[PDB]
Nucleic acid binder design. Structure first.
Length: 181
RNA sequence: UAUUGACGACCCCGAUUGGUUCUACUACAAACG
């Protein structure tokens, strides 16, 4: 528990970065706009137990990061009047929950066989991750939803100059999105 | 108006499928009287 809780005390700071990316419009000093967000890990013990090391193993190339994991959970409608609205949508937890649903949807609509081919490619450069995706994008039409480019040819989207993706977060959370409701 | 006057081989592989699906860490030892 101790290691898990000190992770949570770091995860809470990563979720709490919404405090300054989503901010009250025309405020001075720049007050946070009330925004709710999650960050989560899933240790496996493999990722490094220290948050700083955990995230640098998911930034495999200098412009490419395989986590979108500070996810805003506040509704878009509530956020629409803040500054930083556009960021909150890309970081909206519903984008993760939808993609998890596509992975869970069904035989599998996206085969795990092919999800893991893409998972492997994500650790390459974008030109190679996009190459693998282009070998697959029209064999599995569900992948039109997992794209983020706006073109349906890459799993990444550009965010402040970084290629960031939810796809590998969706594979992580695929089995941690269960509810009695 | 319909005549001139006999030679000569060709094909040599073509089309397509080129991976598909599943397993992606599991128990542990540190947590918990």
């Amino acid at each position: 528990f101790s290691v898990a809780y000190t992770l949570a005390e770091r995860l809470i700071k990563s979720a709490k970065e919404v405090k300054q990316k989503v901010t009250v419009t025309n405020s001075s000093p720049i007050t946070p706009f009330p925004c709710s967000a999650i960050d989560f890990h899933i240790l496996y013990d493999s990722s490094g137990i220290d948050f700083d090391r955990i995230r640098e193993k998911l930034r495999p190339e200098d412009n490419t990061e395989l986590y979108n994991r500070p996810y805003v959970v506040t509704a878009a409608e509530n956020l629409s009047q803040a500054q930083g609205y556009e960021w909150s949508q890309a970081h909206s937890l519903q984008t993760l929950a939808d993609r998890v649903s596509y992975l869970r949807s069904e035989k599998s609509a996206l085969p795990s066989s092919q999800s893991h081919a893409l998972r492997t490619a994500l650790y390459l450069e974008k030109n190679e991750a996009d190459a693998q995706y282009s070998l697959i994008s029209q064999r599995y039409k569900i992948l039109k939803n997992f794209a983020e480019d706006g073109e349906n040819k890459s799993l990444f989207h550009l965010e402040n100059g970084k290629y960031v993706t939810r796809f590998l977060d969706a594979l992580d959370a695929k089995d941690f999105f269960a509810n009695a409701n």
